[PDB]
Design a protein around this ligand. Structure first.
Ligand code: FMN
Length: 364
């Protein structure tokens, strides 16, 4: 089974290639990591396995879901340290995903009920609805398009949060540049309507992600930085007119950061849509072949599809989301080819510290 062939992810020696994909679960009450998160990540940690946390706020304006953790306060750092320690006690490697939602937010999630920030002043359309703290679905509001000074201060929020993650003991961080959130609002030509130096051309639309990645690389070192993007996912009205070209332009920026810094990033992590199969696969392989480094694929993977991806050279690591929700021992089940247990979508985003969170059983 090639998923169990060791892999060197820079300074990290992994024993297997099954990765816990980053998943928002909304148990971090009041944005503070809770003991429940410790039990949840400990259940899924394995010796030499790689875990990526749920998306974590970089600032008070960065949230668009209830009860997501932050890493911008020293109280948050203290509580994350307790979670990182239990994961490292099992010999796992763990990165914190740094997440800013941009326009995918609501007044209820913003300080003083201010407008969310974005590349644009246009709202996500009413084709999409935001999950509200009471469990209802709300309307995304009009965001405020930020100036370039404000862009630079968001970059400094990523930098500070990366340093905070290292302070809590994380092995590294992942930049969430996917799924229609703030970075993708700059990347995608279906969203970025700017006429300044952060809009228009591919080079301009890639400036924000390049500056975010360079800032964290300078602060913590490239080998502790992963980058996640999704050029071919249109979530929250985030379409590009040429997804492959956009992906390749991002990849060229990452290769350039590596050459300038004299080091490689920990990885590039791409999530694919599952609409089709041959075209989606070809786009993934084209991005992988363009990138000078480690490639993590994600989106709809199963045991068999992950085996195929590694065996065919299409990816170095395979991340799993929903199967890891319901199979805390997913790694062992994959190793043994044991049947996998279903997940219950109704408890993906609830606040209960146990139910649908830590009460999915291990193999008998
Ligand atoms: C409940 C849930 C929450 C998720 N939250 C995040 C997140 O915080 N950050 C992110 O980059 N992707 C997030 N994702 C996407 C997953 O990381 C992953 O790409 C997707 O689940 C992979 O597909 P799979 O579930 O078929 O394995 C989330 C997915 C789910 C189902």
């Amino acid at each position: 089974n090639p998923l169990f062939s060791p892999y060197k992810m820079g300074k990290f020696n992994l024993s297997h290639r099954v990765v816990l994909a980053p998943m928002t679960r909304c148990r971090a009450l009041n944005n503070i990591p809770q003991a429940a998160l410790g039990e949840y990540y400990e259940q899924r940690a394995t010796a030499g396995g790689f875990l990526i946390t749920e998306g974590t706020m970089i600032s008070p304006t960065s949230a668009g879901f209830p009860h997501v953790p932050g890493i911008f306060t020293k109280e948050q750092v203290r509580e994350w340290k307790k979670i990182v320690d239990v994961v490292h006690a099992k010999g796992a490697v763990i990165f914190c995903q740094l997440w800013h939602v941009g326009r995918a937010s609501h007044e209820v999630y913003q300080p003083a009920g201010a407008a969310p920030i974005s590349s644009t002043e246009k709202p996500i359309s009413n084709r999409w609805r935001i999950l509200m703290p009471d469990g209802t679905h709300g309307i995304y509001p009009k965001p405020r398009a930020i100036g370039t000074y404000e862009i630079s201060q968001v970059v400094e929020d990523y930098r500070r949060s990366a340093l905070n993650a290292i302070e809590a003991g994380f092995d590294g961080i992942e930049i969430h540049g996917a799924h229609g959130y703030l970075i993708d609002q700059f990347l995608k030509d279906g969203i970025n309507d700017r006429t300044d130096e952060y809009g228009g051309s591919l080079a301009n639309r890639c400036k924000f992600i390049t500056q975010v990645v360079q800032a964290v690389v300078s602060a913590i070192g490239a080998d502790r930085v992963g980058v996640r993007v999704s050029p071919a996912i249109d979530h929250l009205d985030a379409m590009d007119s040429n997804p492959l070209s956009l992906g390749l332009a991002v990849v060229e920026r990452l290769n350039k950061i590596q050459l300038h810094s004299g080091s490689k990033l920990a990885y590039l992590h791409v999530t694919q849509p599952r609409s089709s199969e041959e075209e989606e696969a070809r786009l993934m392989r084209t991005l992988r072949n363009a990138y000078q480094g480690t490639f993590i694929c994600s989106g709809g993977y199963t045991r068999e599809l992950g085996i195929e991806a590694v065996a065919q050279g299409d990816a170095d690591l395979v991340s799993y989301g929903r199967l890891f929700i319901s199979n805390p021992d997913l790694v062992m089940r994959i190793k043994l080819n044991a049947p996998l247990n279903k997940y219950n979508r109704k408890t993906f985003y609830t606040q209960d510290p146990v139910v649908g969170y830590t009460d999915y059983p291990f193999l008998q």
